[PDB]
């Protein structure tokens, strides 16, 4: 009976490939040649944030584009004012092995998680003035690798147990569980309309999930090795994935197939972080070679390098207004770039 | 601009208080040594954990053990709440002082798996600086298995037949030559990978530990002291 299912899956995959080939009548690189290139881009580090003892593993900007939360493996969750460099808050974490941190869109809460398999949510704006843990979401059986807030009450967290989960924070229970991945889910991205989200996993595949239904809307493949960074295009119709095979790929949700590939011969180091510019014209990717590269996401020509970090560039983010880019590395320093 | 000045003053005062707290936390973060405990289920890494607990706790997957030797703090983390695909979370332990690697040397069937895990750890891009304290647990079981026969190690390692015990060995007084040859063969099997890559930036520290062994804390202390001594000696423009 297993052979019949294998043959059915093979013919379904063949149909998928044939439909994609039929729809792939052109490439993004063909007709974008006439587009004027973005040109060489230099953006010096406007600020340097230095208060972290150990390597920075994640960060997240605030929706006001001024405050930003960062996580370090020493066990701290410093909130920085990117303008005045002052540390607004410094949350000591129960477990120092944290791989992710999130900033609520309202700004009232900050989430974090990691090797403890627990998503801890801290109420920033308490009545007493001190930051205390407001919730401890448990139920993931692997390390937590990404956290993103839908709102003050709903949070989507990806884990190393090959599953994503949407939690109702008020009750603290898994509202829904997205189980389609084969490897560890390394990063997720909420859509601008927050009705869908893409998760890239350690199975060299990304998946589009719809939040309400809880089903795998779409599946995208093409990466040789495992994906460890992902983010939507500003319109939510596309996303980008950085992988350990030292390449980024831009997929489009509607076309259901890979659109662009960003890679170079001298780049043999895996991408650690990926984000888009405000317009999506620029794709900023932090690599293992201690550098961050800026890609013309429409032409796939490397236009800009954010050199200046002494260790692996673990985390990377761009503000909602696009004014600044914060890159954090394993040398325990964040850098605000513009 | 009175409101702006007051806001800036309050922000600076909060930043100063937080920075003082951060200095206080830094004075203790550098005063402790992080240790990553690795091994298979059969290896008595939990046994070592309990033995140095007699000399701290964990229930969220990670088991944390805090111990002190000569007023020096060691924090050891046994990551036991994940899946067996460790190629991703292990990169968290790049700044760890040392990786304790516990090997069940009694059973030869899983010894090649332990050797391959050691190879991956030693040759990892983010772990090629970390030194490994190799504990070869269950030496009494290995002695009994070797002396009892009917459990030939040559079946799993053909090159054992063309192997003689090293001249610079330190066998126990009441120890059979055969078990000395076997255990030093296992140690040299691990040292073959150890002394094949990573030129001088990290070293392996093999140890022969039984089920009960109260010197494990002192051995870790001495090996970490040697690791830090080598790090200091490398500060003189060496690399």
């Amino acid at each position: 009976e297993l052979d019949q299912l294998r043959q059915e899956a093979e013919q379904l995959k063949n149909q998928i490939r044939d439909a994609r080939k039929a729809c792939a009548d052109a490439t993004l690189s063909q007709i974008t040649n006439n587009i004027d290139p973005v040109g060489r881009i230099q953006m010096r580090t406007r600020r340097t944030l230095r208060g972290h003892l150990a390597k920075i593993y994640a960060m997240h900007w605030g929706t006001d584009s001024r405050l930003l939360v960062s996580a370090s493996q020493d066990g701290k969750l410093i909130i920085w004012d990117s303008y005045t460099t002052n540390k607004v808050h410094a949350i000591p974490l129960r477990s120092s092995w944290v791989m992710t941190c999130a900033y609520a869109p309202s700004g009232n809460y900050v989430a974090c998680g990691g090797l403890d398999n627990i998503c801890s949510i801290y109420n920033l704006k308490t009545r007493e003035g001190n930051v205390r843990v407001s919730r401890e979401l448990a139920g993931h059986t692997g390390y937590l690798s990404c956290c993103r807030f839908l709102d003050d009450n709903q949070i989507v967290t990806s884990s190393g147990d090959t599953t994503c989960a949407l939690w109702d924070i008020e009750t603290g229970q898994q509202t829904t569980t997205f189980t389609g991945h084969t490897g560890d889910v390394m990063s997720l991205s909420l859509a601008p309309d927050t009705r869908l989200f893409v998760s890239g996993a350690c199975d060299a595949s990304a998946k589009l999930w719809d939040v309400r239904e809880g089903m795998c809307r779409q599946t995208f493949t093409g990466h040789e090795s495992d994906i460890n960074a992902i983010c939507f295009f500003p319109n939510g119709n596309a996303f980008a994935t950085g992988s350990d095979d030292a390449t980024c790929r831009l997929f489009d949700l509607r076309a259901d197939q890979e659109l662009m590939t960003y890679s170079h011969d001298n780049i043999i180091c895996g991408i650690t972080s990926v984000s888009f510019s405000k317009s999506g014209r620029l794709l900023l990717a932090g690599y293992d070679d201690f550098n961050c590269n800026v890609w013309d996401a429409l032409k796939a020509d490397r236009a800009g390098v954010l050199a200046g970090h002494d260790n692996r560039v673990s985390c990377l983010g761009v503000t909602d207004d696009g004014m600044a880019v914060a890159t954090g590395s394993w040398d325990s320093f964040l850098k605000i770039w513009n | 601009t009175e409101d702006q000045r007051n806001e800036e003053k309050a922000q600076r005062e909060a930043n100063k208080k937080i920075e003082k707290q951060l200095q206080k936390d830094k004075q203790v973060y550098r005063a402790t040594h992080r240790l990553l405990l690795l091994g298979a289920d059969n290896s008595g890494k939990s046994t070592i954990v309990k033995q140095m607990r007699i000399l701290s706790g964990g229930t969220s997957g990670i088991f944390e053990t805090k111990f002190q030797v000569d007023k020096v703090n060691f924090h050891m983390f046994d990551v036991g709440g994940q899946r067996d695909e460790r190629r991703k979370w292990i990169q968290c332990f790049n700044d760890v002082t040392a990786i304790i690697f516990v090997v069940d040397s009694s059973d030869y069937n899983r010894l090649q798996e332990a050797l391959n895990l050691f190879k991956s750890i030693w040759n990892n891009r983010w772990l090629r600086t970390i030194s490994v304290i190799l504990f070869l647990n269950k030496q009494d079981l290995l002695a009994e298995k070797v002396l009892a026969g009917k459990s030939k190690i040559e079946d799993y390692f053909p090159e054992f037949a063309r192997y003689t015990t090293p001249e610079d060995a330190t066998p126990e007084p009441g120890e059979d030559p055969r078990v000395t040859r076997a255990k030093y063969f296992i140690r040299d099997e691990f040292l073959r990978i150890s002394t094949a890559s990573g030129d001088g930036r990290h070293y392996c520290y093999p140890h022969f530990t039984c089920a009960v062994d109260t010197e494990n804390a002192r051995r870790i202390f001495n090996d970490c002291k040697d690791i830090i001594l080598q790090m200091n000696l490398r500060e003189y423009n060496l690399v």
């Epitope: 084969t182 040789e224 095979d245 043999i268 | 067996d84 695909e85 991956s120 040759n123 891009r125």
Partner: nanobody, 126 residues
Framework: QVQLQESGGGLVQPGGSLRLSCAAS????????MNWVRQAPGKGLEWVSD????????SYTGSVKGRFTISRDNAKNTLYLQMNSLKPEDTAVYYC?????????????????????RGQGTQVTV
């Protein structure tokens, strides 16, 4: 997408010979170290042998050191394991495993939680 399709093997006499082949698609065969692992009934996956990116650091487990010979063809993107003097202990299912990342000397491929870059397998009964 990456795919490792195994072929060869089956029913062989206790002492005969076989050759397992592994066709790789979706990735550059040259940049990855390849492995042969196997899973016999009653026990979990075990690593049989591996070969480096070019084919200069061939290594084997001790039980197959003198018999099995692993060899890769980058032009054909294929991985072969030539088995001879087969014993009944080789009655496992043989999987062609691929190391997770290119240009690396470290591999974690024996995992029983469905390692992604591992083939479907071939039954080799002796």
């Amino acid at each position: 997408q990456v795919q490792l399709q195994e072929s060869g093997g089956g029913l062989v006499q206790p002492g005969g010979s076989l050759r397992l082949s592994c066709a790789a698609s979706g990735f550059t065969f040259s940049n990855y170290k390849m492995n042969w692992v196997r899973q016999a009934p009653g026990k979990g996956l075990e690593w049989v042998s591996d070969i480096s990116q070019s084919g200069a650091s061939i290594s084997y487990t001790g039980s197959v050191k003198g018999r099995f010979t692993i060899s890769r063809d980058n032009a054909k993107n294929t991985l072969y394991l030539q088995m001879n003097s087969l014993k009944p202990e080789d009655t496992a299912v043989y999987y062609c495993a691929r190391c997770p990342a290119p240009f690396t000397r470290d591999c974690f491929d024996v995992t029983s939680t469905t390692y992604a870059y591992r083939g479907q397998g071939t039954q080799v009964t002796v």
